[PDB]
Fold this sequence. Notes:
The N and C termini lie far apart (about 115 Å). This protein has one domain (about 1-75): Up-down Bundle (Single alpha-helices involved in coiled-coils or other helix-helix interfaces). The protein is mostly loops. The chain has helices at about 25-30, 45. It is rod-shaped. The longest helix is centred in the middle third of the chain and has 6 residues, at about 25-30. The PDB classes it as membrane protein.
Amino acid sequence: MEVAMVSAESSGCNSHMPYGYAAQARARERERLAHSRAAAAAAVAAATAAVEGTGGSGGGPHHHHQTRGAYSSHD
């Protein structure tokens, strides 16, 4: 849909009404639907471990094969 480019301006610069959040009144009308996303708990659903945190690698080697007997009594 070809169209001409519009540009809100008048004279060199005798009116540059910087309408910032002022044009945020539109969000106020959309925020009404942002009331349903209250109980979202999604982006966090995935995140936040299952309250888990316990480690400790290891097995437990049991001494095997003792030193030489030596000194044998039999007299």
